[PDB]
Each structure stands twice: as structure tokens, then as C-alpha cells.
Design a protein around this nucleic acid. Structure first.
Lengths: 76, 60, 155, 174, 45, 194
DNA sequence: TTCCGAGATCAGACGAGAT
DNA sequence: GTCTGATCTCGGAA
């Protein structure tokens, strides 16, 4: 609950990083897509519709963690 | 003239000792992503790129 | 108003003389501020004398970069200049030192000691081919699929 | 060479998630990055994230609000306190939150200096109506001024895990 | 007792092997001119 | 000239006020005229302070290079008065055999050593040196916990640093540094000592 | 009496990449 | 072909 409630540019990159690679292995798509064949262009459609089945595990450097749903974050 | 300098290497010969792509266009190239450009890829914070660019598509 | 600049090095012998208000006198030699005025004044000269020589050449720069470079350079006790020698007193891991200069001695000497290095930083995770933890590899990602720690069966 | 020595020491620093900047070995170099935890990249001129004169004039021009009362000096300091402690502005550390307040009173006195010359604000009606557009600051703007200066300050923080020293090695070396 | 006092972590290696009575030759796959220095040893051996 | 035999006494009674003793305020600030009571005599030890905590014992041995015997002059009155801490403010420096005599008799009595021209300026009121503040034992435990940091892993200041030697700090203590800035002025950093 | 300062000699390094 | 800290030898002293 203590880290920044803004999705950083390093979290948006990897969430788009692995949701692209998930959807390029026939994952179920959450956005009823409209002809986009680039898997990366599907993932930004997933982000803006805020439907990504991914929870960011944010590591405080002592070892404790703090989860954050991608629904529960403020993208830019 | 650009015909003597146009160059692209998809996947070709690797050097016999270190199994990296060779040096030169006469030997089908591969251009060195040098250690100065390593820091540029560090400073962007792109972690999964550097694993892809220095382990996956060079020495897998 | 009058001040006087010297071309010398003996700082506290200058700071203590009669007439000079030693509360307001600086150097440009960051070691002679470290020996004489503590480390924290040696941090502020490394901030200043870089930000003095950077605005002299045009070349504007944020202070927050120099506030990091100074604060790295003086955080382990004394001012550790970024040479080959200052890296040994800053880093523990071998391959980060071994990828820098003196690759022969730094690898044999860390075999003489039984040096167990963990693989961290970026100069070793790039060598080993691990995704580095600096930047996009800091956190990690979960999946949000349907799961629960379920009840078992009666046995 | 000086690029090489710089980046071969400074590469393994990143601003962790609790805003501290640590080495690879866990040891703390800085407690907040650069005192305020702010990106130099997103940083505005003068090493300040806002440059408040530009944002307030931007807000007055993007949102001119006609048919609005625009009363001031007795309401401006009163609206800027009612908005600033209102369920928000907790993550704004109060060194920036002072800096809005010293700017708002700095533009609060600029209003009364013009209304000192002429044009009493007795209820917002004098006979030449144009005079209330001298320093118009109407409270639809000053609340959008704060919700922008908050969010421009919150956005221009150092994003956690950003290869902080690797930015430093380029910005000294280049 | 006195091996850790020379700071040699004896799980890594005791001081008797700072000098060479046998010697690993590197594998052939990492040398397809250092072979020439190996045969110069066995000549002298 | 006497700008010293006075300002040194001015400095150490700023120094042991910062270290938390009970120097009355009128004894702290003297103009030179308040020290012109003794001013002609001491050039051509009459200067030794004992102050206690809310007890140090400074020394100005008139010998330039203090030898082991000169320490041994007041090794005995150190253990006579049951005093635990001392100061030896020297003129030139210690003889290179005498500095061990401090660390041979280390845990019984402390007796830190200063030079003269080291002490002629108060380095705390220097513009470059920010306000070091020694933190208490409970001030460390609320530090480590907030940052979730082990005692080690804090930024480190040497024990022989000029401001650690000023404030009189043994190993294991943590100073709090208020570095002044321009936007905030309250950029706080901490330092574990070595 | 020993120990620490100051005299000699010794190190590893001295940008990317390209044909 | 220097620029470099380290590490070895001399020497004058409390």
C-alpha cells in the first residue's frame, strides 16, 4: 500500500512485454479485437480497456513484497 | 557508393572458436553491439531486451 | 570587497591564520577538504567543483545527477575516486571488477580467497545471461487466473 | 575512457520501490534520489518540476470561465486552503506544498495591488465591467491549477527501478 | 586451523595447490597457438 | 597573536557544549578583552578545563611535541579524579610513539587528541559542513525500521573524520546530517560511523 | 633502543565502430 | 611512452 500508485514506464513495458508473448502463444484475448494481427498492438488494446490478467509483484528491497493489480493502477 | 556498404545479416556463419557471428560483411557480417551501446540499453532500463540482444540472438 | 585565492594545498594551516574567516573558505581539491573538513564538505565540493566546471563550459546539467555521483563517490567512509583502484573499494563482486581493468589479478586474487559472489548488478547478469534486476527486472509479474487454496478430501 | 570508467562503477544503481537508491549489494547510497525523488528528465527549467508562472497562465487560457465571479484576495487564499487539505495532497511532501502556497500568496498580492489602484471588489460589480478582467483567477481555474500542479509533480517523480546511475553516467559523460 | 587465517576458504581450496604438479590442458573445442605452448611443455617434461 | 589562546578556548567551549556538557553561557562567549586578563603572561599551564555532563578534561601542554612522559604527567591525575574522558590539544602534534599510548590505554580512559590549527576554526559553523547531529539509541531503531535497513548498509563516515572526531563518536553510532538545499533545506541523510 | 616519513621502482592502461 | 598507486629500502628521532 506504500509504493507509488502510478504504473511506471518499466511496469508498462513488461506488462506489455509478457501480455504480448502470452497472446502470441494463443492466450484468450480479453478485448474482442478488431483485426489487429500484431500481438503487441493487441496488448495495448488490453491495457487501455484495463483487462489484463496480470498482477505486478513489487519487491521492496528488504524482501517484503506488495501486490498491485494492473486494473488497480494509473496508466499514462 | 551504398552498394558497397548495404549490409544485413539474418543468420549466417558463426566463428569457430566463440560461436558468435563473424566480423565483416565479406564474411556475412554481424555488427558489434558494443559495450558502449550496452550502457545505453542499461540506462533505458530495458532488462529483457539485453537478455534477448546478448544471449538469445547472439550466443544461445 | 576583497578576498584572496592561493595556489596551495595546506588547507587547515590556511584556514587557521589570523584575518581569514575560516568558516567561509573552500578548496577545489576534494581530498584536502576530506582530510580537513570532514566527508560532508568533501561531498559538497564534488557537487560544486563539477557543477562549477560544467557551467563554465556552457554544458548545463541537472544537479540531481551530480548529487548522485558525489553521493556514490563518498558513501563508504572516504572519498573513493572512480579509477581502477576505487572500484575495488566500492564493489564486492568479482566479474564486475573483472570486466573492468586488471582482469588477470582480479580473477586470481578472488580464487586465492574463496570468493563466493552472488550474481547481481548488471555487469554479471549480462555476462551470465540472466535478466538483470535493474529496471524492468526489478519487480516480477504474477498471473490472475482462477485459483484458490482449496479444501482437501476426507481420508 | 572517462565514459567507460564512469559507467563501470555507476551501472548497478536503481531507485528501489521504497524511494531509496541502493547499490547492487543492498547498501544505501541515497535515501531519496536527489533529495526530492524527482526525474531530471521530467524536471522543468531551474531544477523545479513546475515553473508555476507558466502553468497558471496556461490554466487561465485553456479554461477561461466567463459568467464566473472571479473574486480574489479574500477568497483566493480561502479557496486554496479549502482545496489543498481536501482528501489529497498527502503524497506531496511539504517542501513543494509550501512552494505552491508561497506562489499563491505571491499572486494573491498581485491581485490586491491592481485592485489598490482602482476597481473595488465590493461585491464584484463596478460600473465599468471590464475591470474585473485585470487579474482574473476565478475559482474554476485555481482548483484546476492545483489538480494540475499536483499531478505534474506526482508524475515527475523518479520511477522506481530506473537505472539511476546509468542515467548519471551518460549525463556526465556526454 | 591455520588455513582460514590466510583467508583461503578451504571449501574452495587449500594452499597446497597454489603450485602446479599436475596441469589441466584446455579442451580442444576452445582451441581450434596455445596448443603450441602445450607441446612445448611435454617436450620439456 | 592571542587570537588563538583565546579562540582555542572559545572553540573547545563551543565543542564541549555541542557534546552536551554544562558550560554556562557567560563562560562560553568571551571577547578578547575578557581574556586580556591573562594575555601578556602566557606568551612571555594556567589553561585546563574540567566540565561535566548534563566529565571531560582538556589539556594544553605547552610542549610542542607531546611525548609519552608528558601524557604520563596527567595519566595519574586522570585516574586520580575518577574522570573518564580527556582532551589533549597539542601545539605541533604527538610524537609517533605517543599515539599508541592512547590506543594502548583505550577502554579505560578515552583522551582524544586535537591539533592547535585544527581547532582554531569551529568546523561546525563552516558553511560547507552541514549540521551533524548524533542520534540516540532509540533514534537508530526508528531509523532502521522505517527503511527496513540492517545497522550496516547505511552510508558510512569514518571514525577519524574531522566532524566525528569533533563530536566524539565511538564506532556503532549513527549521525543525522541535515544537508541544506535550495528547494527544501531539509535534505536529511544519516551516516553510520566506522 | 623501533617506527614512521621519504627517498625508487613498478604497474596496467591509454574511446566507438567500420571497409 | 608517460600516468599511475603500491611496495620496498633508508634515516633521523623520543
Amino acid at each position: 500500500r506504500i509504493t507509488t500508485p502510478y504504473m511506471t514506464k518499466y511496469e508498462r513495458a513488461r506488462v506489455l512485454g509478457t501480455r504480448a508473448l502470452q497472446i502470441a502463444m494463443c492466450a484468450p484475448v480479453m478485448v474482442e479485437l478488431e483485426g489487429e494481427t500484431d500481438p503487441l498492438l493487441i496488448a495495448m488494446k488490453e491495457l487501455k480497456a484495463r483487462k489484463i490478467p496480470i498482477i505486478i509483484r513489487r519487491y521492496l528491497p528488504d524482501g517484503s513484497y506488495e501486490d498491485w493489480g494492473v486494473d488497480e493502477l494509473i496508466i499514462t | 557508393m551504398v552498394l558497397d556498404k548495404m549490409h544485413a545479416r539474418a543468420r549466417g556463419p558463426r566463428a569457430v572458436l566463440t560461436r558468435q557471428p563473424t566480423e565483416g560483411r565479406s564474411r556475412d557480417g554481424g555488427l558489434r553491439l558494443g559495450e558502449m551501446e550496452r550502457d545505453c540499453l542499461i540506462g533505458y532500463g530495458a532488462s529483457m531486451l539485453l537478455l534477448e540482444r546478448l544471449m538469445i540472438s547472439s550466443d544461445a | 570587497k576583497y578576498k584572496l585565492l592561493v595556489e596551495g594545498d595546506n588547507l587547515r594551516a590556511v584556514m587557521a591564520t589570523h584575518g581569514v574567516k575560516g568558516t567561509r573558505t573552500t578548496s577545489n581539491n576534494t581530498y584536502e577538504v576530506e582530510k580537513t573538513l570532514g566527508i560532508e564538505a568533501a561531498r559538497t565540493t564534488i557537487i560544486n567543483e563539477i557543477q562549477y566546471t560544467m557551467v563554465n563550459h556552457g554544458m548545463s546539467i541537472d544537479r540531481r545527477h551530480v548529487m548522485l555521483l558525489s553521493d556514490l563517490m563518498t558513501y563508504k567512509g572516504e572519498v573513493l575516486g572512480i579509477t581502477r583502484f576505487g572500484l575495488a573499494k566500492m564493489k564486492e563482486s568479482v566479474l564486475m571488477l573483472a570486466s573492468f581493468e586488471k582482469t588477470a589479478d582480479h580473477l586470481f586474487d578472488a580464487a586465492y580467497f574463496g570468493q563466493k559472489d552472488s550474481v547481481c548488478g548488471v555487469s554479471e547478469c549480462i555476462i551470465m545471461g540472466i535478466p538483470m534486476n535493474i529496471g524492468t527486472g526489478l519487480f516480477k509479474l504474477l498471473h490472475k487466473a482462477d485459483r484458490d487454496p482449496n479444501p482437501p478430501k476426507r481420508p | 575512457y572517462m565514459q567507460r570508467r564512469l559507467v563501470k562503477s555507476l551501472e548497478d544503481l536503481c531507485s528501489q520501490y521504497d524511494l531509496t537508491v541502493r547499490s547492487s549489494t543492498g547498501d544505501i547510497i541515497q535515501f531519496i534520489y536527489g533529495g526530492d525523488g524527482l526525474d531530471p528528465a521530467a524536471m522543468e527549467g531551474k531544477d523545479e518540476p513546475l515553473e508555476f508562472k507558466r502553468v497558471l497562465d496556461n490554466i487561465k487560457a485553456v479554461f477561461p470561465c466567463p459568467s464566473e465571479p472571479a473574486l480574489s484576495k479574500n477568497e483566493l487564499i480561502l479557496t486554496t486552503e479549502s482545496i489543498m487539505k481536501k482528501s489529497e495532497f498527502l503524497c506531496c511532501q511539504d517542501s513543494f506544498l509550501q512552494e505552491i502556497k508561497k506562489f499563491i500568496k505571491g499572486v494573491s498580492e498581485k491581485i490586491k495591488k491592481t485592485r489598490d489602484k482602482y476597481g473595488i471588489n465590493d461585491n464584484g460589480t463596478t460600473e465599468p465591467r471590464v475591470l474585473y478582467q485585470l487579474d482574473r483567477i476565478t475559482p474554476t481555474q485555481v482548483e484546476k491549477f492545483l489538480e494540475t500542479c499536483r499531478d505534474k509533480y506526482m508524475r515527475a517523480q523518479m520511477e522506481p527501478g530506473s537505472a539511476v546511475g546509468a542515467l548519471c553516467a551518460q549525463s556526465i559523460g556526454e | 586451523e591455520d588455513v582460514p587465517l590466510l583467508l583461503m576458504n578451504p571449501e574452495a581450496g587449500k594452499p597446497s595447490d597454489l603450485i602446479l604438479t599436475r596441469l589441466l590442458v584446455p579442451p580442444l573445442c576452445i582451441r581450434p597457438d596455445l596448443t603450441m605452448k602445450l607441446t612445448e611443455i611435454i617436450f620439456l617434461n | 597573536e592571542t587570537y588563538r589562546l583565546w579562540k582555542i578556548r572559545k572553540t573547545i567551549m563551543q565543542l564541549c557544549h555541542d557534546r552536551g556538557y554544562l558550560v554556562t553561557q557567560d563562560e562560553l562567549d568571551q571577547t578578547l578583552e575578557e581574556f586580556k586578563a591573562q594575555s601578556g603572561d602566557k606568551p612571555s599551564t594556567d589553561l585546563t578545563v574540567l566540565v561535566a555532563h548534563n566529565q571531560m578534561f582538556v589539556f594544553f601542554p605547552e610542549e610542542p611535541k607531546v611525548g609519552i612522559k608528558t601524557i604520563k604527567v596527567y595519566c595519574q591525575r586522570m585516574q586520580e579524579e575518577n574522570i573518564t574522558r580527556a582532551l589533549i590539544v597539542v601545539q605541533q602534534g604527538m610524537t609517533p610513539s605517543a599515539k599508541q599510548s592512547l590506543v594502548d590505554m583505550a577502554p579505560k580512559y578515552i583522551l582524544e587528541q586535537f591539533l592547535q590549527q585544527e581547532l582554531l576554526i569551529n568546523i561546525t559553523e563552516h558553511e560547507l559542513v552541514p549540521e551533524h547531529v548524533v542520534m540516540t539509541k532509540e533514534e537508530v531503531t526508528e531509523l532502521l525500521a522505517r527503511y527496513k535497513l540492517r545497522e550496516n548498509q547505511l552510508p558510512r563516515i569514518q571514525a577519524g573524520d574531522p566532524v566525528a572526531r569533533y563530536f566524539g563518536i565511538k564506532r556503532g553510532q549513527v549521525v543525522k546530517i541535515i544537508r541544506p538545499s535550495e528547494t527544501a533545506g531539509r535534505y536529511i541523510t544519516y551516516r553510520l560511523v566506522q
